[PDB]
Design a protein around this motif. Structure first.
Motif, PDB file in Angstrom:
ATOM      1  N   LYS A  80       0.826  -1.209   0.000  1.00  0.00           N
ATOM      2  CA  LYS A  80       0.000   0.000   0.000  1.00  0.00           C
ATOM      3  C   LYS A  80       0.865   1.266   0.000  1.00  0.00           C
ATOM      4  N   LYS A  81       1.935   1.339   0.803  1.00  0.00           N
ATOM      5  CA  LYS A  81       2.804   2.504   0.833  1.00  0.00           C
ATOM      6  C   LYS A  81       3.433   2.772  -0.571  1.00  0.00           C
ATOM      7  N   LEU A  82       3.947   1.696  -1.169  1.00  0.00           N
ATOM      8  CA  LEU A  82       4.451   1.820  -2.545  1.00  0.00           C
ATOM      9  C   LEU A  82       3.469   2.343  -3.553  1.00  0.00           C
ATOM     10  N   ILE A  83       2.280   1.793  -3.546  1.00  0.00           N
ATOM     11  CA  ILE A  83       1.304   2.121  -4.527  1.00  0.00           C
ATOM     12  C   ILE A  83       0.925   3.627  -4.327  1.00  0.00           C
ATOM     13  N   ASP A  84       0.651   4.005  -3.091  1.00  0.00           N
ATOM     14  CA  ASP A  84       0.340   5.419  -2.831  1.00  0.00           C
ATOM     15  C   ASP A  84       1.458   6.350  -3.298  1.00  0.00           C
ATOM     16  N   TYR A  85       2.696   5.921  -3.097  1.00  0.00           N
ATOM     17  CA  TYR A  85       3.919   6.614  -3.607  1.00  0.00           C
ATOM     18  C   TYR A  85       3.896   6.820  -5.113  1.00  0.00           C
ATOM     19  N   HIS A  86       3.523   5.795  -5.839  1.00  0.00           N
ATOM     20  CA  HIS A  86       3.488   5.847  -7.314  1.00  0.00           C
ATOM     21  C   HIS A  86       2.322   6.719  -7.761  1.00  0.00           C
ATOM     22  N   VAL A  87       1.212   6.677  -7.032  1.00  0.00           N
ATOM     23  CA  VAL A  87       0.087   7.584  -7.409  1.00  0.00           C
ATOM     24  C   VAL A  87       0.563   9.000  -7.229  1.00  0.00           C
ATOM     25  N   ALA A  88       1.137   9.295  -6.094  1.00  0.00           N
ATOM     26  CA  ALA A  88       1.600  10.656  -5.742  1.00  0.00           C
ATOM     27  C   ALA A  88       2.679  11.158  -6.704  1.00  0.00           C
ATOM     28  N   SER A  89       3.501  10.233  -7.210  1.00  0.00           N
ATOM     29  CA  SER A  89       4.682  10.570  -8.005  1.00  0.00           C
ATOM     30  C   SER A  89       4.444  10.806  -9.474  1.00  0.00           C
ATOM     31  N   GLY A  90       3.320  10.364 -10.011  1.00  0.00           N
ATOM     32  CA  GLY A  90       2.949  10.463 -11.435  1.00  0.00           C
ATOM     33  C   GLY A  90       3.387   9.264 -12.275  1.00  0.00           C
ATOM     34  N   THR A  91       3.715   8.153 -11.590  1.00  0.00           N
ATOM     35  CA  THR A  91       3.957   6.890 -12.390  1.00  0.00           C
ATOM     36  C   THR A  91       2.811   6.581 -13.252  1.00  0.00           C
ATOM     37  N   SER A  92       3.020   6.184 -14.505  1.00  0.00           N
ATOM     38  CA  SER A  92       1.967   5.880 -15.452  1.00  0.00           C
ATOM     39  C   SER A  92       1.180   4.641 -15.257  1.00  0.00           C
ATOM     40  N   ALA A  93       1.838   3.558 -14.777  1.00  0.00           N
ATOM     41  CA  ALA A  93       1.209   2.240 -14.593  1.00  0.00           C
ATOM     42  C   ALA A  93       2.168   1.414 -13.717  1.00  0.00           C
ATOM     43  N   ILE A  94       1.574   0.355 -13.202  1.00  0.00           N
ATOM     44  CA  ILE A  94       2.304  -0.576 -12.356  1.00  0.00           C
ATOM     45  C   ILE A  94       2.290  -1.925 -13.044  1.00  0.00           C
ATOM     46  N   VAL A  95       3.483  -2.523 -13.216  1.00  0.00           N
ATOM     47  CA  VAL A  95       3.528  -3.930 -13.603  1.00  0.00           C
ATOM     48  C   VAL A  95       3.739  -4.740 -12.285  1.00  0.00           C
ATOM     49  N   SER A  96       2.779  -5.598 -12.020  1.00  0.00           N
ATOM     50  CA  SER A  96       2.677  -6.367 -10.795  1.00  0.00           C
ATOM     51  C   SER A  96       3.177  -7.805 -11.145  1.00  0.00           C
ATOM     52  N   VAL A  97       4.126  -8.226 -10.371  1.00  0.00           N
ATOM     53  CA  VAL A  97       4.729  -9.601 -10.443  1.00  0.00           C
ATOM     54  C   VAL A  97       5.362  -9.813 -11.835  1.00  0.00           C
ATOM     55  N   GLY A  98       6.113  -8.804 -12.274  1.00  0.00           N
ATOM     56  CA  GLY A  98       7.141  -8.961 -13.359  1.00  0.00           C
ATOM     57  C   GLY A  98       8.380  -9.578 -12.781  1.00  0.00           C
ATOM     58  N   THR A  99       9.471  -9.448 -13.519  1.00  0.00           N
ATOM     59  CA  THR A  99      10.790  -9.960 -13.044  1.00  0.00           C
ATOM     60  C   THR A  99      11.214  -9.359 -11.709  1.00  0.00           C
ATOM     61  N   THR A 100      11.058  -8.035 -11.564  1.00  0.00           N
ATOM     62  CA  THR A 100      11.489  -7.327 -10.343  1.00  0.00           C
ATOM     63  C   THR A 100      10.554  -7.704  -9.156  1.00  0.00           C
ATOM     64  N   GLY A 101       9.341  -8.118  -9.486  1.00  0.00           N
ATOM     65  CA  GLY A 101       8.345  -8.616  -8.527  1.00  0.00           C
ATOM     66  C   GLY A 101       8.516 -10.082  -8.138  1.00  0.00           C
ATOM     67  N   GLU A 102       9.582 -10.745  -8.575  1.00  0.00           N
ATOM     68  CA  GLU A 102       9.868 -12.105  -8.152  1.00  0.00           C
ATOM     69  C   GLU A 102       8.861 -13.107  -8.626  1.00  0.00           C
ATOM     70  N   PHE A 103       8.423 -12.977  -9.863  1.00  0.00           N
ATOM     71  CA  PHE A 103       7.522 -14.015 -10.374  1.00  0.00           C
ATOM     72  C   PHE A 103       8.031 -15.450 -10.296  1.00  0.00           C
ATOM     73  N   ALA A 104       9.325 -15.637 -10.405  1.00  0.00           N
ATOM     74  CA  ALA A 104       9.821 -17.056 -10.393  1.00  0.00           C
ATOM     75  C   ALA A 104       9.620 -17.752  -9.041  1.00  0.00           C
ATOM     76  N   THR A 105       9.614 -16.974  -7.938  1.00  0.00           N
ATOM     77  CA  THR A 105       9.554 -17.654  -6.660  1.00  0.00           C
ATOM     78  C   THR A 105       8.212 -17.555  -5.909  1.00  0.00           C
ATOM     79  N   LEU A 106       7.211 -17.038  -6.577  1.00  0.00           N
ATOM     80  CA  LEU A 106       5.792 -17.119  -6.077  1.00  0.00           C
ATOM     81  C   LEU A 106       5.176 -18.276  -6.788  1.00  0.00           C
ATOM     82  N   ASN A 107       4.325 -19.019  -6.088  1.00  0.00           N
ATOM     83  CA  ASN A 107       3.431 -19.989  -6.771  1.00  0.00           C
ATOM     84  C   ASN A 107       2.328 -19.261  -7.468  1.00  0.00           C
ATOM     85  N   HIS A 108       1.586 -19.917  -8.380  1.00  0.00           N
ATOM     86  CA  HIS A 108       0.587 -19.178  -9.145  1.00  0.00           C
ATOM     87  C   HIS A 108      -0.430 -18.532  -8.207  1.00  0.00           C
TER      88      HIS A 108
END
Ligand SMILES: N[C@@H](CCCC[NH3+])C(=O)O
Ligand SMILES: N[C@@H](CCCC[NH3+])C(=O)O
Ligand SMILES: N[C@@H](CCCC[NH3+])C(=O)O
Ligand SMILES: N[C@@H](CCCC[NH3+])C(=O)O
Ligand SMILES: [K+]
Ligand SMILES: [K+]
Ligand SMILES: [K+]
Ligand SMILES: [K+]
Ligand SMILES: [K+]
Ligand SMILES: [K+]
Lengths: 292, 292, 292, 292
Positions: free
Chosen positions: B25-53
């Motif tokens: 939640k803190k991150l997401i609010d940060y990105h809203v406040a900052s003007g980030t265009s979109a969020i990619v959730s559970v990409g490479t940086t999100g550690e997709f390889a080590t989460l189960n589906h």
């Protein structure tokens, strides 16, 4: 058995992509008759990526059942998440497999320390012998000799399937490990060279279709009869190359179908059917080897 | 949002390795406040390889819930088996996510025909927009421009995240696809260059910790103000490089913790904690960027 | 002599960059006493690039004069223009050299057919034995085994100095050439592996400072006593690596000065003096080898 | 002229391999008529490796004479020995040439400190403007941006011909040098991209046979008209690629002969005549460009 010609066996499939027990039985009987040392079940060649965990276990168990004690079975147990690798390993504990073949994590590119912790954790939670597997061209990471030396101190880490094709690795690793640590090639085209340098055998694609010649080549190599072994290798060299003319195991499954060892050459997406040009190249290589 | 500064957001964890809702939640609010265009959730940086589906799906759905319509959410949906990619994508059908980021199959090294069939099959099982994702250093596969052209003909294949760092790909791809196909950098250190050549944005690691600067840089680029954008780029260049001093997302998670954006810098094996030398390098880069 | 430990001898220089006859004499006597098989004069290690043709010939002739029949001399005669190579070769005809070491053309990147015509022309115009030299990391081209096989049919092309470090080349070349064609490593760190695979010796940088150990290692290898040879190799391995810590022959000339074998470590631009960190790394390697 | 379309002109030969004055004159008049910005005489495409220095100097001086002040002439003056580069440059001091194109030393693989000292020494022995030239695929050496920064401080080092094809180098170098340091592409296939990023022109092989098109493309680029420039680029893309179907300048000399610009397509060994398959490929590329 962790020496000589070990086959990285295809997972034969029907037209629906489900495992074909009758085809698998015929392969296993072929390996028993032809002197293959052991069977790696659901390795790379066995399409581990496209089986789910249940199916992967099913194939290993079916291979053990069909082998019926006549040939040792090593299970592919690699994963790119350490928890997943542990989990899959537990499914095989007391199954009858003799050991596990465990690939360096792919895609996520861990550090050498990450690889050390990954493999250390997996080894801790089984009494099965573990064979490390390095294949940078697939995984994006390279398990270096120094880290192999660190891991060989773990009691049940007993060898490595080295698939770089970089032959300098043989003796870099050998100097860091005890005399009983097994060095196996994972690169058919350089495997005889690998054994000549001190390697103990090969985990082979070519062995799927040339099991007797592979077994005799690896025995001659183990005895020091390299010139003799090399005559066999030169008849197999077009297969060692052309079984990778399209992505493995596309060519070898087609070749197994062409010889009558399996009912269909079906694979799972994203692997696709062999091209016509690939059929012709593979067939020529089979003929060169004297198999058709 | 498939243009501008798109964050490949970390999956923040507690000490046990499970998703930390307060941190997310803190991150997401940060990105809203900052003007980030979109969020990619559970990409490479999100550690997709080590989460189960299931875990992966839970993180995506939590991110969508927390975004609360304020910022568009693209789900990571890649897999190296086509059946599995289809399954994962189907989890998000009618969910609220705006599209999917789908990596080329890793490890199994399919052919270009295999890549075409994989992505085509996935696109056929959803109405969601698909962003292809090419990162050969991790996957062992390179989705070439010709194949990207062929796939761009599928209605809902709408863009590519090009993480080769090979800037010749921008115009090679652009000339084979329609004017509305989106080109996004997957390589922070070359991303301004990528936009200067015609690209539309970046899916960024650096945006996790310099979200305002990244958003300002991308807006300046889109406007043709390259020299002003480059000043910002130079201030962020040490992060663009040093966020990969150890394997991503090890450095960026530590940086997030150091900035107070997340509670802990925990990751899942085989990713391991940042080294002391790493912490000092990353802290120096953050100080250069004026973030600390 | 075209087997065993062959030294790629430094061209010792005074402070002005001119050849030091007294230093060269001391080296040559050292090689005679230490059992080196032959001396390659004005190879890569002898700074062929920065001597003009007259100086290059002067050094070869001085080396022959000083050797005084006690050790065979092979001259570096390579060039990237076929006329120039012919010309330089003619200067040595009836000089007393036993053969020539001729590098694949560098910078201009000829085709395999160009390499074939280049070497065929040079061989045609001399009765001296020719040893081909492949070093792609320096030249930008790679003389492939198929072309080596074509050239080995030319009567006076008698071997190859293979400096790729790619050990698969040994047996790829061996299978295409007659049993009397000489295979020599040009890569000290992989040379013992090269001999174990069927190579006949090494054209060595390390031999400049460890001539006796190199000679005994190559004899043990030739006799099949690889485990024994490998003990020597492991004491030499830090030198095989660290003699390239800065560009060759920067480190080896410093090492020769440190041992007292040459009066000065001077080179010609663009080679520059060893750094302090390089002195310390090289010294540690000399100590590991038991030489200081 | 150190901006726009700069031709790396062929050294046209007669059947004997010596410079053909009538052909050279026809070329030069062609480039004047076409709007080429400058001529680089005896660069890589001009066969500098296989001319002796006197021959090299004669070609430069003939080109200067024939240009007759109509078009500026830059001399190739590179060498892999610093003394030799100084000698060659001194031949052209007070000659009429406008500057020098000087390649990083090839084969000997100097350090970056070595490169710095080499180019500094050369610049110190002339008043002529120096264009550095980096082409690691041919030389085995890579002149990095940091070193290019260091050299750009020398008064008469004024630009770089960057032939890596690695477009990240444009802005890496630009940020380390003054606004008047010139960045020129050495890679035809990426050159428009290179100018789009900030580069000032190209030293081109393609301009030998598409001089008008290249000049129009570079003018459009300089004006910021990238889309119009790209249309021209697409028409020339098959030449940009297929002029390297066999080793440069084998294809471009044949193309020049086919267009009637030179009398013969002769080259010096180790460059060899174009193959029949090569001729057909290059003819197809010329037809695509509308030149035939
Ligand atoms: N397709 C996934 C899961 C495979 C699970 C069973 N082997 C991977 O390659 O990791
Ligand atoms: N660790 C396996 C499964 C991940 C499944 C959920 N993201 C792989 O990387 O494919
Ligand atoms: N420096 C030039 C000429 C050297 C001539 C004597 N070896 C080259 O490396 O080709
Ligand atoms: N062939 C030698 C000398 C060329 C001298 C005149 N361009 C070299 O490439 O350095
Ligand atoms: K255990
Ligand atoms: K062990
Ligand atoms: K589309
Ligand atoms: K002859
Ligand atoms: K011969
Ligand atoms: K300057």
């Amino acid at each position: 058995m962790f020496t000589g010609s070990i086959v990285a066996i295809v997972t034969p499939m029907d037209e629906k992509g489900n495992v074909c027990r009758a085809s698998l039985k015929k392969l296993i009987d072929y390996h028993v008759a032809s002197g293959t040392s052991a069977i790696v079940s659901v390795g790379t060649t066995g399409e581990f990526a496209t089986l789910n965990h249940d199916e992967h276990a099913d194939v290993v168990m079916m291979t053990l059942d069909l082998a019926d004690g006549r040939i040792p079975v090593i299970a592919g147990t690699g994963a790119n998440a350490t928890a997943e690798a542990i989990s899959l390993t537990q499914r095989f504990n007391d199954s009858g497999i003799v050991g596990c073949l465990t690939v360096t994590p792919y895609y996520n590119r861990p550090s050498q320390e990450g690889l050390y912790q990954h493999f250390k954790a997996i080894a801790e939670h089984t009494d099965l012998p573990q064979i490390l597997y390095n294949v940078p061209s697939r995984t994006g990471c390279d398990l270096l000799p120094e880290t192999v030396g660190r891991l060989a101190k773990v009691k049940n880490i007993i060898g490595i399937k080295e698939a770089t094709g970089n032959l300098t690795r043989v003796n870099q690793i050998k100097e860091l490990v005890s005399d009983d640590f097994v060095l196996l090639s994972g690169d058919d085209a350089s495997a005889l060279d690998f054994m000549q340098l001190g390697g103990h055998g090969v985990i082979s694609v070519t062995a799927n279709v040339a099991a007797r010649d592979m077994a005799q080549m690896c025995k001659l190599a183990a005895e020091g009869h390299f010139a003799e072994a090399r005559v066999i290798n030169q008849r197999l060299m077009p297969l060692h190359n052309k079984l990778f003319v399209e992505p493995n195991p596309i060519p070898v499954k087609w070749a197994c179908k062409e010889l009558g060892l399996v009912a269909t050459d079906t694979l799972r997406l994203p692997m696709t059917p062999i091209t016509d040009s690939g059929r012709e190249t593979v067939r020529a290589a089979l003929k060169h080897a004297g198999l058709l």
